Structure 1
């Protein structure tokens, strides 16, 4: 379970899921990657369900990079609903993930080995994905 230590404000507004964009997106650390096809809030408990799917496939081997992080607090009302009184009660955290972003992104593993891991890893995710390799297009920098 990822989660920021030391937050500046618990409880931030929801805000929209618009505009697939903004960095991540080019595969900077590894030999292969999982890229977001659709936007979502992806949950810490979702990210670790992906992380473990993969380390399990490497039998504790390989290198795994993550690269999305749950800094956005997710609140909830207890059950007992009634609208008001306040906002209340952070459950989890999410990372906002719009299209074309690379999450995860393995390295140091055989191609068909990583490609099997990333595919597993993908089923733990709410959105659709794409697996990618690395490129001239991923430039140099």
Structure 2
């Protein structure tokens, strides 16, 4: 399939669910792994649609057209969102398929980029993509430390320090 159209059945209805909320110190998906720069969702955990991620991709291509770059996607739309009619009454079963979506935890990377381009030219492409995506986004470089929840592990900070009851 694709990162926007999975090889799943639209008839099997999926429960709403919730995005992951790491409460045990997990940094899963909070670092740049493939590209040199990344786009991080820094505010809150959300469920992004496939039409919003497609527009974000078009915005990065429209701004970087005519140049050499490699765009990576770290999210996959594998969550079916079934919307019942707004004009319908409550009950009478679950709604029909509307669109695909993906659940993203806080401080996770959405897009990564690698190419022979200038940093400022990539900051603008991610700035525009962030403007059109739901929530607040941030520019990240490869090598930056991971994030535990909403706290960055900077200046020798470790996960065991965040778990230690004594922190004063």
TM-score normalised per structure 2: 0.74
3-state secondary structure, aligned to 1:90: strand
Give the structure 2 partner of residue 130 of structure 1.
Answer: 138
Aligned ranges 1:73-92 → 2 under 5 Å? 73-92=80-99
Cα distance in structure 2, aligned partners of 1:83 and 1:124 = 32
Contact 1:51–1:66, Cα closer than 8 Å, also in 2: no
Query: Relative to 1, partners in 2 of residues 1:88 and 1:127: Cα closer, same or farther, differing over 3 Å?
Result: same
Change (3 A) 1:89 1:60: farther
- Ranges in structure 1 where 5+ consecutive residues have no aligned partner: none
Describe the SS at the equivalent of 2:40.
Answer: strand
Q: CA deviation at 1:79?
A: 3.7
Is this contact kept in 2: 1:17–1:40, CA < 8 A?
A: yes
Q: What is aligned with 2:37?
A: 32
Alignment of 1:62-77 (within 5 A): 62-77=69-84
Aligned-pair Cα RMSD in Å: 2.1
Look up the SS of the partner of 1:13 in the other structure.
coil
Structure 2: unaligned runs, 5 residues or longer: 147-168
Report if aligned partners of 2:10, 2:97 keep a CA contact under 8 Å in 1.
Answer: no
Task: Report the equivalent of 2:159.
Answer: none
Q: Which residue of 2 aligns with 1:104?
A: 111
Query: Does 2:61 correspond to 1:55?
Result: yes
Q: Comparing both structures, which one devotes a greater share of its residues to strand? A: 2
Cα deviation code 1:74-115 (max 9, x no counterpart): 011124311121102010111101111101111102211111
Q: Considering only CA atoms, is the larger Rg found in Structure 1 or Structure 2?
A: 2
Runs of 4+ aligned residues of structure 1 deviating over 3 Å after TM superposition are 6-9
